[PDB]
Design an enzyme around this catalytic site. Structure first.
Site, PDB file in Angstrom:
ATOM      1  N   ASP A  35      14.381   3.392   2.645  1.00 47.69           N
ATOM      2  CA  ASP A  35      12.544   1.991   2.451  1.00 47.69           C
ATOM      3  C   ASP A  35      11.147   2.711   3.120  1.00 47.69           C
ATOM      4  O   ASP A  35      11.246   2.841   4.385  1.00 47.69           O
ATOM      5  CB  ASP A  35      13.515   1.445   3.676  1.00 47.69           C
ATOM      6  CG  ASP A  35      12.348  -0.198   3.586  1.00 47.69           C
ATOM      7  OD1 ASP A  35      11.222   0.383   2.626  1.00 47.69           O
ATOM      8  OD2 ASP A  35      12.601  -0.825   4.553  1.00 47.69           O
TER       9      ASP A  35
ATOM     10  N   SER B 275      -5.597   1.404  -4.938  1.00 52.60           N
ATOM     11  CA  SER B 275      -5.617   1.732  -5.551  1.00 52.60           C
ATOM     12  C   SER B 275      -6.967   1.800  -6.880  1.00 52.60           C
ATOM     13  O   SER B 275      -7.732   0.669  -6.242  1.00 52.60           O
ATOM     14  CB  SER B 275      -4.665   0.430  -6.754  1.00 52.60           C
ATOM     15  OG  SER B 275      -4.668   0.425  -8.570  1.00 52.60           O
TER      16      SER B 275
END
Length: 330
Positions: free
Chosen positions: A35, A199
């Site tokens: 994770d 992004s």
């Protein structure tokens, strides 16, 4: 040194991925959920409340000659999905894919929430976010990666998750045969303890690319792709009959649909998520309404590039002095 381990979807939907991890002496192999959005290595154990164990493999520290109780240490964690676990702490030898750390903090669960009990395939979590998020008290502990880093050939790990198929976690090296083209690196903020990056935009299907900054985290422990409501609405508007259902808890779509792809930007590069990666199947057994793999982050407080996005790429988690993230197509 290096390590390399195969990671395997837990079910036919890729709801999560499990990777075998050797703990203790002699080794006890547990299948952990790696994770990159958390920083605790915790396991089902011989200390876990018996009624809360249902099929998991447990760590028994009393059977490990290298286990030592970390005196006075406790831990307690709550995850974004509402699940939680807590317990006490041992140090022991932990190996992943041939890479060994001695003295790793292994957090033994005394209590786990129902979601963990109900998932027989996940024996615990191995956190790969920054150690500043580790919950051990009164002395915070380091992640497996943080402990291994100085010994690694290069201070990196990579995630290469499969779509409906196994993939690979590598530590200490970049497998140049595992991706196509080049890896595009992008800046990381560690201020919130995550692999947080920005992004450069998105496209839906064969549509034009929208240049827009989307801050979010690269999180292997989250199944879906959570993005701003504007972006998510633009995606689902291209699927006839798709709608946001408050009763179900997100966007659903007719199972008869053909889903468009979704592209996200990494600098000037582009990662394309095929439409089929966005299908999470019937909302309940036998339903013709299917659950979407792109959902709104509104009210999460952060955008999450979960497995839906990451499995479309070869992803480098670069833990150099100034961390960065790399993405390549594959």
């Amino acid at each position: 040194s290096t390590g390399s381990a195969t990671t395997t979807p837990i079910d036919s939907l890729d709801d999560a991925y499990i990777t075998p991890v050797q703990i203790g002496t002699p080794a006890q192999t547990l299948n952990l959920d790696f994770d990159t959005g958390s920083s605790d290595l915790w396991v089902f154990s011989s200390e876990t409340t018996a009624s809360e164990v249902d099929g998991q493999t447990i760590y028994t520290p009393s059977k490990s000659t290298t286990a030592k109780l970390l005196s006075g240490a406790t831990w307690s964690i709550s995850y974004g999905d509402g699940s939680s676990s807590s317990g006490d702490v041992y140090t022991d030898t932990v190996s992943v894919g041939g890479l060994t750390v001695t003295g790793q903090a292994v957090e033994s669960a005394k209590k786990v929430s129902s979601s963990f009990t109900e998932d027989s395939t996940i024996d615990g979590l191995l956190g790969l976010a920054f150690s500043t998020l580790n919950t051990v008290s009164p002395t915070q502990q380091k992640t497996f990666f943080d402990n291994a880093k100085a010994s690694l050939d290069s201070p990196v790990f990579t995630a290469d998750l499969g779509y409906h198929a196994p993939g690979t976690y590598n530590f200490g090296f970049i497998d140049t045969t595992a991706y196509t083209g080049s890896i595009t690196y992008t800046a990381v903020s560690t201020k919130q303890g995550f692999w947080e990056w920005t992004s450069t935009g998105y496209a839906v299907g064969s549509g034009t690319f929208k240049s827009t900054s989307i801050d979010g985290i690269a999180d292997t422990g989250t199944t879906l792709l959570y993005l701003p409501a504007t972006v998510v609405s633009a995606y689902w508007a291209q699927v006839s009959g798709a709608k946001s259902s408050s009763s179900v808890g997100g966007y659903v779509f007719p199972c008869s649909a053909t889903l468009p792809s979704f592209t996200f930007g990494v600098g000037s590069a582009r990662i394309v998520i095929p439409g089929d990666y966005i299908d999470f199947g019937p909302i309940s057994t036998g339903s013709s309404s299917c659950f979407g793999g792109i959902q709104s982050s509104a009210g999460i407080g952060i955008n999450i590039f979960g497995d839906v996005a990451l499995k479309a790429a070869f992803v480098v988690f670069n833990g150099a002095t100034t961390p960065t993230l790399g993405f390549a197509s594959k």
